[PDB]
Design a protein around this ligand. Structure first.
Ligand SMILES: Nc1ncnc2c1ncn2[C@@H]1O[C@H](COP(=O)(O)OP(=O)(O)OP(=O)(O)O)[C@@H](O)[C@H]1O
Ligand SMILES: [Mg+2]
Length: 369
C-alpha cells in the first residue's frame, strides 16, 4: 500500500501536517510558509531544517513549473525569500502555499520510507474558491526531489486524486474525541453538545468558530488577530532591554522551542512545578522569569476575556479551546480546566496540531468508508 494518510492545516505562519507513520501513530510537524528560488543543485524534526527541493507539478506555472526551491526555515535566511504579504490592515501566491504543502508531503513520505505515494487530501477552507476548486488545484502528480538535507537524492511521487475540505463538517472537532494508535481509539475525557465553540488560539490569529448541529454558524463564527506573536514580541523586547545594562534568539520559534517549550512541558505534567526562564546572551546569563511570565499571563487573561465575550455571543454549551496559544499561555489558561463551559484537550501537548489531527482522523474515517 503506497498510501500516505494525513491532515493538512495550512495557514500563513506555517503549514502543519499530521500523518500516520509506519507504526500507525500520528506524527506532526510544521513548515514555515516561506519559499525562495534555488539553483538546480546544492553547494526533533531535523529533516526539515534544510529543505532544498526540485518540484515538478502542473499546479505550478512559468517560473515555477519545474525548478528548485528552498522551503521553510532554510529559506527564512535567503535574501530573496518570499513570504505572505499581509495588508496594513492565488495566482501569484499559490506557489507560496503549494510548495510548502507538497514539501510536507514529500517529507512525510521520506519519513515512512516511501517514494510513491497517493495522498488523499484532508484540509480546511481558507480565511470564489469553492471546495472542489481548491481540490482541483491539487489533483494529479507532483514530484519532489531532495537536492540536499537528510533525504538528498530521494524523489517523491505524490499523487492526489481526491479530498475533502471538511467544509461545513464536524471533522473540525474530531481530535477532541479521538486519537489514532494504529487504529481509532476513543479518548478518555470530554465529557461531551449540540452547540460548541472551537477556539483555535494561533500565532497571528485566533479562530473563534461556533457549531450548531455540528455545522458552522457562519454569522457568529469569526477570526481575530489575537495571536501570540504580539505578546511574544513584547517579551523578547523586554529581555533584550534587561540585557542592555552591563538579540538572544533568531526567530520566535527559536524562543518557543528552546526557552519556553521545556518549561511548559514540565508545568503540564506537574501542577506544582514553578517555571524558570533563563537566557544566555554573550558573556551574560539573565533570569528573565518575571518577564516571560508577565507576557504569558497578560496573554492568558486577554484570551480569557475573548473567550467569555465569544461564549456570550453564542451561548454555546461547551467551549473547546485548542491551538498553540493554550500551551504558550498555559500558565493562566490551565485555569480553564476548572470551569464548566470549557473543554481543553486532555493530551494538551498535541494542542497546536489539533486541527491537523482532526483532519487526519477525518481522513482515516473516509478511507474506512
Ligand atoms: N509546546 C508549546 N509550548 C509553548 N508554546 C507553544 C507550544 N507549541 C506551540 N506554541 C506557540 O503557540 C503559538 C500558536 O501556535 P500554533 O501552531 O497554533 O500557531 P499557527 O496555527 O501557526 O497560527 P495561525 O493560527 O496564525 O496559523 C505560537 O506562538 C507557538 O510558537
Ligand atoms: Mg492556526
Amino acid at each position: 500500500k503506497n498510501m500516505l494518510l494525513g491532515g493538512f492545516d495550512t495557514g500563513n505562519i506555517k503549514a502543519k501536517i499530521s500523518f500516520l507513520n509506519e507504526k500507525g501513530n500520528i506524527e506532526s510537524f510544521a513548515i514555515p510558509t516561506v519559499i525562495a528560488e534555488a539553483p538546480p543543485a546544492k553547494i526533533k524534526d531535523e529533516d526539515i531544517e534544510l529543505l532544498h527541493v526540485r518540484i515538478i507539478s502542473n499546479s505550478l506555472d512559468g517560473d515555477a513549473r519545474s525548478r528548485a526551491w528552498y522551503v521553510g526555515a532554510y529559506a527564512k535566511d535567503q535574501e530573496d525569500r518570499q513570504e505572505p504579504t499581509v495588508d496594513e490592515m492565488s495566482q501569484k501566491n499559490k506557489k507560496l502555499h503549494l510548495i510548502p504543502l507538497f514539501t510536507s508531503m514529500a517529507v512525510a513520505a521520506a519519513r515512512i520510507g516511501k517514494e510513491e505515494v497517493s495522498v488523499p487530501f484532508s484540509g480546511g477552507m481558507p480565511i470564489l474558491r469553492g471546495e472542489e476548486q481548491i481540490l482541483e488545484m491539487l489533483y494529479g502528480e507532483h514530484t519532489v526531489e531532495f537536492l540536499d538535507g537528510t533525504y538528498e537524492g530521494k524523489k517523491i511521487k505524490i499523487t492526489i486524486n481526491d479530498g475533502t475540505m471538511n467544509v461545513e463538517g464536524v471533522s473540525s472537532v474530531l481530535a477532541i474525541l479521538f486519537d489514532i494508535v494504529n487504529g481509532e481509539i476513543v479518548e478518555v475525557e470530554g465529557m461531551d453538545g449540540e452547540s460548541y465553540a472551537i477556539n483555535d488560539l494561533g500565532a497571528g490569529t485566533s479562530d473563534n468558530a461556533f457549531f450548531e448541529d455540528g455545522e458552522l454558524n457562519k454569522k457568529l463564527s469569526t477570526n481575530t488577530d489575537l495571536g501570540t506573536n504580539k505578546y511574544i514580541d513584547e517579551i523578547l523586547k523586554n529581555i533584550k532591554e534587561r540585557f542592555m545594562e552591563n538579540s538572544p534568539f533568531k526567530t520566535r520559534e527559536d524562543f518557543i522551542q528552546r526557552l519556553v517549550m521545556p518549561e511548559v512541558e514540565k508545568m503540564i505534567e506537574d501542577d506544582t512545578y514553578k517555571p524558570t526562564f533563563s537566557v544566555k546572551w554573550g558573556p551574560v546569563k539573565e533570569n528573565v522569569t518575571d518577564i516571560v511570565m508577565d507576557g504569558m499571563l497578560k496573554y492568558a487573561e486577554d484570551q480569557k476575556a475573548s473567550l467569555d465575550k465569544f461564549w456570550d455571543k453564542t451561548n454555546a454549551d461547551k467551549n473547546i479551546v485548542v491551538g498553540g496559544g493554550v500551551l504558550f499561555g498555559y500558565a493562566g489558561l490551565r485555569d480553564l480546566k476548572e470551569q464548566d463551559g470549557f473543554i481543553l484537550p486532555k493530551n494538551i501537548q498535541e494542542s497546536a496540531y489539533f486541527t491537523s489531527r482532526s483532519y487526519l482522523i477525518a481522513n482515516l474515517l473516509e478511507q474506512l468508508n
